[PDB]
Structures are given as C-alpha cells and as structure tokens.
Design an enzyme around this catalytic site. Structure first.
Site, short mmCIF file in Angstrom:
data_model
loop_
_atom_site.label_atom_id
_atom_site.label_comp_id
_atom_site.label_asym_id
_atom_site.label_seq_id
_atom_site.Cartn_x
_atom_site.Cartn_y
_atom_site.Cartn_z
N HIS A 330 0.80 -1.23 0.00
CA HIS A 330 0.00 0.00 0.00
C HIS A 330 0.85 1.29 0.00
O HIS A 330 0.41 2.35 -0.44
CB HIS A 330 -0.91 -0.03 1.23
CG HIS A 330 -2.13 -0.86 0.93
ND1 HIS A 330 -3.27 -0.35 0.39
CD2 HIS A 330 -2.32 -2.23 1.12
CE1 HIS A 330 -4.11 -1.39 0.26
NE2 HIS A 330 -3.57 -2.53 0.69
N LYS A 518 -9.39 14.20 6.09
CA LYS A 518 -8.27 13.28 6.04
C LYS A 518 -7.78 13.02 7.46
O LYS A 518 -7.78 13.91 8.31
CB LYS A 518 -7.12 13.92 5.24
CG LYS A 518 -7.48 14.29 3.79
CD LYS A 518 -6.44 13.79 2.78
CE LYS A 518 -6.98 12.67 1.89
NZ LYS A 518 -6.03 12.39 0.81
N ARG A 519 -7.16 11.85 7.66
CA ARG A 519 -6.46 11.64 8.92
C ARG A 519 -5.46 12.78 9.19
O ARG A 519 -4.78 13.25 8.29
CB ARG A 519 -5.70 10.31 8.82
CG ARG A 519 -4.83 10.06 10.05
CD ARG A 519 -5.65 10.10 11.35
NE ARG A 519 -6.94 9.44 11.16
CZ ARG A 519 -7.01 8.12 11.42
NH1 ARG A 519 -5.94 7.48 11.85
NH2 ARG A 519 -8.15 7.46 11.21
N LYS A 524 0.10 15.42 5.55
CA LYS A 524 -1.18 15.78 4.97
C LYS A 524 -1.36 17.31 4.88
O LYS A 524 -2.20 17.83 4.16
CB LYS A 524 -2.30 15.18 5.82
CG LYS A 524 -3.07 14.08 5.09
CD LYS A 524 -2.25 12.81 4.90
CE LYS A 524 -3.07 11.53 5.12
NZ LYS A 524 -3.33 10.88 3.84
N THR A 626 -8.43 7.55 -1.98
CA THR A 626 -9.80 7.22 -2.34
C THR A 626 -10.81 8.33 -2.01
O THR A 626 -11.80 8.48 -2.70
CB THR A 626 -10.20 5.91 -1.66
OG1 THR A 626 -10.02 6.04 -0.25
CG2 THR A 626 -9.33 4.77 -2.18
N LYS A 630 -14.06 10.07 -4.25
CA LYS A 630 -15.44 10.27 -3.81
C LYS A 630 -15.86 11.71 -4.08
O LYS A 630 -17.01 11.97 -4.44
CB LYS A 630 -15.57 9.96 -2.32
CG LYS A 630 -15.05 8.56 -1.98
CD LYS A 630 -15.13 8.28 -0.49
CE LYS A 630 -14.40 6.99 -0.12
NZ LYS A 630 -14.14 6.95 1.32
#
Ligand SMILES: *Cc1c(COP(=O)(O)O)cnc(C)c1O
Ligand SMILES: *Cc1c(COP(=O)(O)O)cnc(C)c1O
Lengths: 788, 788
Positions: A330, A518-519, A524, A626, A630
C-alpha cells in the site's frame, strides 16, 4: 408485499415488547433491521450454496470501515420507499430511525474503507468473495473535544442488539496460544448488492475466554484476579490498532493478527472438507488476498494446519501455500513494513515459530542455489537480526504482489521491493484503488443520481459508472449545468441543516464549501490549510480584502493518540475557527467548521455538498487517495499536489479541469537541499504576520504551549535538516496563489465552474471499485461471476 | 394462531437463513420472538392498567425463574400450535425447548417463592411488579470430577435472550461514593394462564459510566484499564457472592443498594407521571421486602424523598412506614443480616447518615415509650458499630409476616419477641405455596389431562382447590389404572432424559425415590445415603430379596466452602459407584446423582417421582415448597413431622403419608442424653455401614473426608454430641418406615395409586394463588385489575 407495515410491525413488536407505534426509535430500528434480515435470508443462503461450489476468494484484512448498514441495504434491495411508507404508517420517521445506528467501528481509514468498497463491488458482480476480519468491540476511538483539544474515548457500536451481525456460537473454533486458550466465535454480516440477489458475507471473529472467569478466585473474593485472564482474551477484540510502544502492546498486536487468521483458515478448511475429499486441491478452489502485512501470519499458520492436522508434507503444503496467497502493498516506503521481535512468536505460539524459522532456513538455501550473494540474501531473509520481516514472508509466499496505482506500483518494483521484483518479476502487477458508486454516489446524492438517470435513460450507471462518460457531451448544455448547480446548492442547504443540528454552528449555504477530510498527519498538511485560513483572516480584517466569495472551510480528522503535533494542529484549527467565527468583520466571508468524530457517516453528509476537495499532501507522500475519488464523483473540484490519485484525476479531466499546484516529487530533493524556511517566514508577504499570530496572543492554546512548538517546527533550521519536513512554508506561496485563483473562478464564472464539475463527474467512472474488483477477479483470483 | 408463517419470519431474521435450515438455537430465538410479538399488546395494556392502580412492588435479591418458553406457551395456550409450526418448519419443539438454559437469577426456595408469587399475581390480575438484579452468571454451575463437586460460572444470557428486553433509554444512575454506575432496566414478561394480563419482572444491570479507561489502555496498562469496568460488573456477575471477607461483604451490600436504589427511583418517576407529587406515594404503592436483602430500600427512599423532592424527615418517614412490608422466613436470628457500619460509610456516606439518624430517633422514641436501656440497645438498628438490617425492617414495616402458622407463632414468641411486644398489630401469617401451572399443568400433561377429563374443565389449573371434589374417585380402579399409566410414562421419560444427560441407564419400573434439596447437614442427605449403604449390604450379604427394585435419586448443590456438605456429595457418588457397579445389587438398587440440580431438572424429576424424601431434622424446616410440588405430582411423602409435612399429613391423613422420626418436642430430652456411639454398636447393620466409610469399601482418595464424616456421627454425648442433627438417632425409625413404604408399593400397587390420588386432590391447599390472594387483600390491599 415488499416490506409491508405488518411485517415490520411484527419484528418491532418482538423487539420492544409493546405495540410498534409505541416503540422507541431504537427498538424500531432494531425491528426494521430484523425485517430486512428476514427478507434476504433466502437469497443469502442461495448465495452461500452458489459460492460454496465455486472457486472462491478470501479477503483477509485487519480492518473493514463498514459504516452504517441499514440505508445501504435498503438502497441495494430497492426498498427505501417501502420502508419510508411502513415506518410512517407505524408512527415513526425513517430519517430518525436511520440516525439510531452508529457506524460499525470495524475499521480505521483508507485501508479499511477500501476493503469495504471491495466487498460491495464483489457482490454487485456476483464474485464469490468472502471477507474475514476481527469483530472489534470499541473501534479505534471516539473523538470529542474539550476546550478545543482532542479527547479520545471508547467507540461502542454493538452494545445494543445489532441484527446485521449474526452470532454462530455453535460454529466456534479454538485458537490456542502457548499461554492462552481462546474460543473464536464467528459472526456473519450480510453484504447486499444493488441490482443483484446475491448477498455476500463478511465474517468477523470475536475472542472469548475458555472459562467466563476464574470462579475459585472470585469465590476467594480476589475480584480483580478473577477476571484478569477473561479481560486479556477480551483485549484481542477490544480496540483496533492498540498502541504498541511497549513489549506487551506489541504482543497484543500479534495476538490479534494470529487470532483472526487462524480462526479464518480453520473455518475455510472446515468448509473445504465439507465440499471436497481432501485439502490436496485447496488452492484450486481457494485464494486469499492479504491486504497489507497484518494478516501475514496466515501463511505459517496454513502450513501448520496442513502438516500438523492433515498429515501433509512440507513440500506439498508450501506448494499449496504458494498458490493460495496474494499480497497487496500500500505504501511507497519501507517504514511501516511490519517487523516483529522473534521472541514474541516464540512466546505466543512456539510451533508457528518453528515453521517461520523453517521458512527462513529453506529460503536462504534456495536463494544460495539461485546464486544470490550473502548480502542480498541477508537483506531479503524473513528473519534477520532477531527480527521477523512480515513483508518478506508475504513476498516470498505470494503468487501475486500488487500496488494500488500505476506510479506506486512502479516504485515498489524499482525501490521498496526491488530485490523481489529482480527474482520474480512475474508476481508484480498493478490494481488501481477505487470506491463504490453505490454508497458514495447513489445512496448519498439522489439529487445527482436523478439527473444521471434521466440523462442516461436508466440507472445502469449505478453498477457501471463508465456509462457516465457518455454524458460528457452535456458539458455544454446550459440547462444541465444549471441543474447541477441547483443540485449542489440543495445539498449544501442540507449540509447546513445537518451541521447546525449536530454542532450548533450556522454557515452560509451559498458560500464555497472548501473541504479537507483526512487523517491528521503533518505530511497531509492540514497545517498548511490552516495557515492559509489564518492569513486570509488577516487579509480581510487588516488588508481590506473584500472582492471575494464567502467560503466555509470544513475540516474532518482524527489524530493518533500520542501524535503530539497532530493533536496540536487540531487544537490550532479549533482556535482559528474561534477567532474567525466570532469576528463580525470576518465571519460574513469566512467561517471554519471542524466536523467532530469524522467517519463514514459524516463523510456521507459532507461529500455531496463539497465544492473544493483539498488533497494537499506533500508531493510524493500519497500512493493513492480514495476520498479524492469520492469528491470527484460528487461534483467537487480537486485542489491539490501532483501526487497520488490527483495524478490520475488530472490525467482524466485535464489540467484545465482541476487546480494543481506545488513542487513536483522530482523537484523536492533539490528544493530541500537548499531550503530556507526561516527566510520564507521573513519574506513571503503575510507569512510572518500569519505565523507570529500563533504565539503573540492572537490565538489561544489555553496555556498549553502547543502553538509555539508548531511555529518553530516550521521556521527552525534550514537545508535538508530543516524542521519543516513537509515543505509547508515551501509550498504555501503557490498554494495560496492557486486557492485564491480557484475561489475567483468560482465567483466570476459559475457556469464555467459547473462545467469543470460535470467533466469530473462524467469521468469518475475510472475510479469505481467495480473495475478494481473485476481486475483482481480476472487477473489474480481467477473468479467467475456466480449468481445465486 | 401462532402460524408457521409468523415463526418462520422471526427465525429467518435471527438466523440469516431459511427457517428449516436454522440451528436449534436460532429457531428457539425466533420462536421466542414470535411469542413476544404476540403478547406485546396485552403487555402494554397491563402496563397502563396497573399504572392507574394501587400497586405492589416485590423486592427480592433472587427470582428462580427457570426456563420461559414452555411456560409462556402453556399460559398462552399455544403449545399445540407451536409444536405444529415447529414441525412444519423442520424442527422438533422438545429439542428447541432444551436449548434454553434456566435463567440463573435465583438461588433456592426464597427465589422460587418470589417466582411462584409473580405467576400467581398475574393469574389473578393483581398489580404486582417484581424487582431484582440481572445476574449474569447465577450462583454457580455444578459439575463433578472424580466424585467431587466442582463449581464454575453459570451463564444463561450470553446468547440472545428475547424474554428480557433492554430499556437503555430509561437508564438511571446509582452513585456510590467510589463508583458512578448506570442502572440499565430490563423487562421480563410474566404470562398468566387463563388471562390476558402480562406482569413484569424488572431486572437491573449495572454498567460502567465509561466503557474502560482509554488513557490506561493506550498506555498499555491493560489490566488497569478495565479494573473499574469489572468492579462495576461485579455487581451483577454472581448472586450470593462469597462474603467471608470485608470486600465480599461490601460487594453484597453494593448489590443490594444498587437494585433497591434503581427500583425506587423508577417507582418515583412512575408515580410522578400519575400524580402531582409524592405526598400520597404510600396510598398507591406497597413494597414487599423479601427477607432482609432489600432493606437498604428503607433509608434510600428516605434519601430520595428528602434530598431530591424537598420533604422533611417527618413526612418522609410517615410514607416509609406505610410503604414497606417485611417477610421473615426462618426461626433463627443468626441468619439475619448484620453489617459493619464502615461498609456503609465507604459506599454511600449520605445513606449512612440517614441510617444513623434512624438509629438516633429510634432510641429516643423508645425511651419516650418507656422501654429500659437494655431492651432499647438490644433492638437498636446500630449496635457496637454493626447495623442490624432486620431491626431497621421491623421498625419501618407496617406488616411483618411469617411463612407458616407455626413459624409465625415462633417469631412472635421468640425470634422477634421484642417487636411483637411493642407492635403486635404488625404480625401475621402468609403460608408459602407453589404455582400449579409450572409445577403441575406445564410439566405433567398426562396427569393434567386426567384431571381435566374428570372435572370437565381446566378451571382447576387456576383454582387447585377444585381438585378436592375429585377425591371420591379414589376408589375407582379405572382412574387408578390411568394414574399408574401416567406415572409409568413419566418415569420412562425421565429414564430417557437422564440417559441422554449423564449416560446412566435406569429401570422405569423401579420405585423412583427422590431427594432434591440443597446439601445441608440438617437436610440429612447423609441419613438417606446411610440407608442406601446398609441396603447394599443387606442385598449383598444378608440375602435380602423380598423387595421391589428402586432408583435412589439425589439432587443437591453444596456451598463452596461447606466442607462437610461437599464430603457428603463425594460419599453419595462413592456409594453410587459401589452400588451401580455390583451385579448382585444393581438389578435391585441404583443410585442417581442428578448433576447441577435446578428448575429444569426438577421439572423432569417431579412428574416421575414415587417417593418424596423430606427428612430434615424435626424443628429445622419452617416451610417446604418442594414438598408441595411432589404432592401435586403423585409422589408419597416420606418425611419428619416438621414444616410442610405437618400440613401435608393434616390434609391427607397419616394413612396416606409415611411420617417417622422424633417429633420436635421430644428432641430436647433425646439430645440431652444422646449416645450416638451406643447406637453405632447396637442398631443392627449400622456398625457395618459406618465402618464402610473408612475400611476401604468406599474411596476417599485418601482425603480423610469419610473418616471425618463417620466421626461427626459417632462422637460425643448429649448436648455436645457431634451428630448435631440426630442422624443416628432417627436412622432406625427411618429405615423401618422407608422399608415399609417400599413393601406397600410392591404389595398393593392400586392401594399405592389410591394414596397418590388423595395427595393430588388435596394439594390445592399449597397453591401460591391462595398465598398471593392473602398478601393482596390483607397486606398490599390490592384489587384485581384486568388489562382487557
Ligand atoms: C473514503 C474514506 C477514507 C479514505 O480517505 P483517504 O484519506 O483518501 O485515505 C477514510 N475514512 C473515511 C471515513 C472514508 O469514507
Ligand atoms: C421448588 C424449588 C426449591 C425450593 O425447595 P426447597 O424445599 O426449599 O429446597 C429450590 N430449588 C428448586 C430448583 C425448586 O424448584
């Protein structure tokens, strides 16, 4: 009749012990869900028989971010209207009933939500895919807020009757650790599918003690002693991803992984020998996908079962193992590549350890014969320096090793798993991530669904999103563009109602909904998003900026419990919100909303109303994305770096239909080489006033000292060792330029904006997990559509 | 109706598979849901009817409920319909019924009486609601290991249990000084034969305020993280938890306060929804205190009235004194609860202040009344730092009742003589009874059929006195023939039941001689066993042969720390091995020890019983509810003149029972010169029996337990003899009578049947319908309140 009030009333009466109209919303939810289970029971069984006679796939994953089940099931069975009717006829409102259900706390983030989308896409195509995981009782954690700081608490979800998990205690198995004999109780969760009668299964395992408690200790009135073993077994399913900084915490993580893989393989073998003579043909009829390294113990464990319980030789057993397992990588980086002290295995399950050691012994001899040098073998071996490398066991055993996007797959070939790709090129392939058009479009955006259905002439698009490409022609149809603007507005009107009711905040339903869900992680760069907002606060209050559309900046994140700067960033966002939300001279044009306890349900309410999708991780840090997908399906435009999913989004809609910015991943090494963040701090207009606002008392961290730490994590140092690891100050100027431009195109060209949004929607079929599953199914698992 | 279509619906919802493929467990679940769906409306109607009436709230630390399905089906008249539906759907009702574990909500007679009361109350439409704790693991489950009793947890609701409905939205708080707990209410339906009313047993579950300490869990202090969660869970974990230490005692008191406080809070809530305030609480509410376990209710109601509803002490105590009634069950004052006041000061300081104020006022009031200091100190609730719960009860209660004529006279004259002298109007008698539904109509369909055929209706089911007019058929051979055939069929059923349950094969034609009581030395299982051992030698060595075959059946649990009791159980298992495995004796004599005796086992034993062993030392038993169950089922009483046996022989005559042994008025002189050693050497065959205890005939596993038992019998003289309960003294008369009884059974089968018939027809005297009618009209002052 499909879901008549009589049937629903019956199940509700049985649950409430009172007539259906006097039942609580909770008991009605329970009755309604029981009604649904009743209706699919037959189909579910037919599916079991159909799949049981077919070659199958078993998806092993340490997490499944399932969200709520009721609306999703009603939608896929096409019963929403009847349920609405039945419920009102019985004196309740379906919208209230649906709110009863808590998201199933069975997953954490993307890895888990991917596994969930996969299950839905699999049944929608009648692929015999069964999911296997742990029945976590309290999820990761529930997030609340105390004075702006994140507080973590248990996240219960099945403390009350939960009809969408059926307990099968008579089918229980034993998972024996060298120090703990446990019961593994199987649970069945139904996976419904839009447009098919097939119902898939998600098998979840719950650990229970051999004895409820130590009665002798209890009777001696040593009350804590009486339940220590009970709660040590209960710890296996208590929470997801328990902290593992200590040895004991690490041992629990490994217990969790051995528990559900052993239980799953045992039941799989059970089932196989009920349909076949013996296990010698196990791999013809079964494949297992290893989602990341969490389930890798399945490999030595299948060896143990085969050799120890079915008298099979090592060669025959390993042959089966090497044809059974496939493995999905991943991330691009080693780092998270699970590594465990061999002593943990030696203590938890000595026999399984012997097998792991035999795998390593054989591996080294086989490589030496392959002609490899000792240095290469040492760095490939599953056991090195007293540590067991789970990803190496996976790469060695798996017949397939895939990445989750074109770029990410190439990196693992060329870097991460380079030695493996060098020995076994043929194992490597790519399977691009995707999301399910059901939950993330049709179920949550009926407004948009309607238009898509009218235009295209049917709802075939729900289960074949590529059908939307046919609609890009309307990009120039002005009446359609207007409809789409009206759909978005209606959704935003809804969102404002939801957030008002949920957190008591009033927002402008007409402003731009700029969303970052988002986490919380420094890479990020929620922090960069925060800066921009802080600076924009000052450009409005002190610089006189007014020729801009109003906007509402929406946040949704959890931070890991011990991640100090992550929690500080969440605190910072809450303080900035307090500053701008209560300043009358600025609230009319800028408001900040932090959605508490972000999860599947909140995502379902946010996405349809989203205008801008913030995907601003440092270039080179995101392999996928992902949530990005969306947003695309729901008419939100991407503001982000040229990394992860944004690459493919831009590739599909073109540079003109998205807002890309920042340094490219190939440019950063040179930029970081001579990075001078402190100079940017002093030079880039506004940035000095922005960052000083963190410790001059403008913002309030309630005496925590957290804001001052953040500030110097950004401006301290220089060069490749600068504290700003994630080039936040470095990209800020380009980020603000682009974000400003984006807001401008928004107030000045409404139809032009709606046009870009339409292009995105119509091209989003590319990110449907139906295509992903088809590809897994045809290329890796080798499955056939299997209707019930 | 209870149509197959309805049942299948509920089964499918529970099983996620067609009803015919569901496991027995899931089918049981669905069928039970089907029953709940059917009574839901009548239940609500009864709620509304009882709520507008004067009510009785029965407080008890135990309710021995047993299984609910067959009882509910029987009272709703749906057994035939349920049987057909089940078969129509591929299953067999008996198999389904066997799935349910007895609800481990009670201990023994005290709890079974409360259960019978609830049934009798609803059958007569009396507004009575029960209140207790939702014990999760009961008392303990009994198993055997090499003849010794082993104790383990007794789970019963780990699987879905549709007969207890959770009402989390109605939860309350019970705050201990060291523990904030949630009180979750659960509703259990009490169906009634011949009526639509559905009563309620309210059971409370204690849950923690926080699921677990997340902060400790994240720190990986896994045990610390759940200590508080499990301390709260201990409240409902086990009933009658051992209290040999301070902590065990504090737990018992915690359990008692928990369910009383929760119950009173719920009662007050409900009162304030039918009346403007609590000034008239006593006019509409009565609370029966079943023994001293619920006495904390008294100070707690005082706390609620004063602290939460602004009432002064005077008014509050006035209400309390007209609200509570107390039931005393034994003749001895050593069982009455006494607690160290420190326990109260630590668990709930405010409640302790009130208890202290109760003592302070009591002393002054009695001084005013003119009692001397000595009498006052000896009646005070608090003496030498110890709180006497029975004294708080006798002081506050408007009614104090005994459970049998003689028992009530004894407590007036001795046990509670101080209170009787002070307040003679509070004392009265309410003779215990048992319900003819569960104990006759439900478990003995064969006999029920005959009774209904002869009487011409089933009115006798709810008016057992109706059977009196059938006594005349005692001379009708056609009826006695039917009676014997019914007993024979019942015994054949039992033989099948035990064979499947413990693999023991028995002769259905032998006399079923049963003793099912808790293991106590005063109960005298030991004398029964002595008789069995002797009989063994008589058959083996003394050539005895003119006797009928017999199966001696024991049912009994021993308190965990009671060494003599546990030694006796081992002895019984030893003798059984000696006897069952000897081809010279087995054909005539077999011993059966029914493991884990409880309600369900009793339901299978009673209908097949021929002899009812009620052999406790005269003077020890105040009641004898099991005695009554045996009578109703056609078993003849072999027992002492004490407790229920007195009334039994009074109703049937000495010719239709086999009374033996020393009367209570003779024992004081007998023991004064008791010479157990002489008896040991002189009663024929006795020496041989007792010697078998330590000469190698019976195996102690070298524990020395049999030797201690032997010595506990043959040692000492007079008031200091070890045979405290006259076991050797009564043995001679016991053997003679038991031998005579067996002789009659075989020589006059029809004469035996006649005696059985008179017992059956005269059993109406022991119906709890009469007991409840008397509570309701003489103490609670209720009127029948029909729902429909
Ligand atoms: C889709 C989704 C994810 C995945 O998000 P990414 O940050 O793009 O990896 C995580 N959580 C929830 C609630 C989601 O629905
Ligand atoms: C009836 C009953 C009792 C009460 O009987 P006792 O004569 O007081 O021992 C206790 N336990 C069970 C299982 C019963 O059914």
């Amino acid at each position: 009749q499909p879901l008549p009030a009589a049937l629903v009333g019956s199940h509700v009466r049985a649950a409430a012990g009172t007539p259906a109209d006097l039942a609580t919303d909770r008991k009605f939810w329970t009755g309604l869900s029981r009604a649904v289970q009743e209706r699919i029971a037959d189909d579910w069984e037919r599916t079991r028989e159909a799949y049981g006679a077919a070659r199958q796939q078993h998806y092993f994953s340490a997490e499944f971010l399932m969200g709520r089940a009721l609306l999703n099931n009603l939608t896929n069975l096409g019963l929403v209207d009847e349920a609405a009717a039945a419920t009102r006829e019985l004196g309740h409102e379906l919208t209230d009933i649906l709110e009863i259900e808590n998201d199933a706390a069975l997953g954490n983030g993307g890895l888990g939500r991917l596994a969930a989308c996969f299950l839905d896409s699999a049944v929608t195509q009648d692929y015999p895919v069964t999911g296997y995981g742990l029945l976590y009782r309290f999820g990761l954690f529930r997030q609340s807020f105390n004075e702006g700081f994140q507080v973590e608490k248990p996240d219960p979800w099945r403390e009350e009757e939960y009809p969408f998990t059926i307990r099968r205690a008579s089918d229980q198995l034993v998972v024996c650790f060298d120090d703990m004999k446990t019961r593994a109780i199987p649970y069945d969760m139904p996976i419904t599918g839009y447009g098919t009668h097939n119902v898939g299964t998600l098998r979840l395992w719950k650990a229970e003690p051999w004895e409820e408690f130590d009665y002798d200790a209890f009777n001696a009135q040593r009350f804590t002693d009486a339940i220590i073993e009970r709660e040590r077994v209960s710890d296996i399913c208590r929470v997801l991803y328990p902290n593992d900084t200590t040895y004991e915490g690490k041992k629990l993580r490994v217990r969790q992984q051995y528990f559900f893989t052993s239980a799953s393989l045992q039941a799989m073998i059970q089932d196989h020998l009920a349909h076949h003579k013996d296990l010698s043909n196990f791999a013809e009829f079964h494949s297992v996908q290893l989602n990341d390294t969490h389930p890798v113990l399945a490999i030595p464990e299948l060896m143990r079962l085969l050799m120890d319980e079915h008298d099979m030789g090592w060669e025959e057993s390993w042959a089966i193992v090497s044809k059974t397992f496939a493995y999905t990588n991943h991330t691009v980086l080693t780092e998270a590549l699970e590594q465990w002290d061999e002593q943990i295995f030696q203590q938890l399950f000595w026999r399984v350890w012997e097998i792991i050691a035999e795998i390593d012994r054989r591996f080294r001899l086989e490589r030496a014969a392959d002609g490899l040098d000792e240095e290469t073998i040492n760095r490939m071996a599953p056991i090195q320096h007293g540590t067991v490398h789970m990803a190496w066991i996976a790469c060695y055993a798996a017949y397939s090793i895939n990445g989750v996007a074109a770029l990410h797959t190439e990196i693992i070939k060329a870097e991460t798993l380079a030695d493996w790709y060098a020995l076994w090129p043929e194992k490597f392939n790519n399977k691009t991530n995707g999301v399910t058009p059901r939950r993330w479009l049709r179920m949550i955006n009926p407004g948009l669904s309607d238009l898509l259905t009218r235009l295209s002439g049917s709802d075939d698009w729900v289960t074949d999103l590529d059908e939307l490409k046919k609609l890009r022609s309307y990009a120039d149809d002005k009446s359609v563009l207007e409809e789409l603007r009206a759909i978005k507005a209606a959704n935003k009107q809804d969102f404002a109602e939801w957030i008002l009711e949920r957190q008591g905040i009033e927002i402008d339903p007409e402003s731009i909904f700029d969303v970052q869900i988002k986490r919380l992680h420094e890479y990020k760069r929620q922090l960069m998003n925060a800066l921009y907002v802080l600076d924009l606060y000052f450009r409005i209050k002190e610089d006189g900026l007014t020729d801009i559309p109003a906007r509402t900046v929406i946040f949704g994140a959890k931070a890991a419990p011990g991640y100090v700067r992550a929690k500080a960033i969440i605190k910072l966002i809450n303080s900035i919100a307090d500053l701008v939300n209560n300043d009358p001279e600025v609230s009319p044009l800028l408001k900040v909303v932090f959605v508490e306890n972000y999860n599947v349900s909140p995502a379902e309410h946010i996405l349809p109303a989203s205008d801008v999708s913030e995907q601003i991780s440092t270039a080179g840090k995101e392999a996928s994305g992902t949530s990005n997908m969306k947003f695309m399906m729901n008419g939100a435009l991407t503001l982000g770096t040229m990394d992860g999913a944004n690459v493919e989004i831009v590739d599909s809609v073109g540079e003109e239909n998205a807002y890309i910015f920042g340094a490219r991943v190939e440019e950063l090494p040179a930029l970081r080489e001579s990075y001078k963040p402190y100079e940017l701090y002093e030079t880039v207009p506004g940035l000095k006033r922005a960052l000083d606002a963190l410790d001059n008392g403008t913002l309030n961290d309630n005496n925590s000292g957290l804001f001052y730490d953040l500030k110097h994590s950004l401006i301290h140092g220089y060069g490749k060792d600068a504290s700003d690891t994630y080039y936040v100050l470095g990209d800020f100027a380009d980020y603000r330029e682009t974000r400003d431009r984006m807001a401008a195109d928004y107030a000045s060209d409404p139809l032009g904006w709606a046009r870009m949004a339409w292009i995105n929607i119509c091209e989003s079929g590319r990110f449907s997990s139906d295509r992903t599953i088809r590809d897994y199914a045809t290329e890796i698992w080798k499955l056939e559509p299997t209707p019930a």
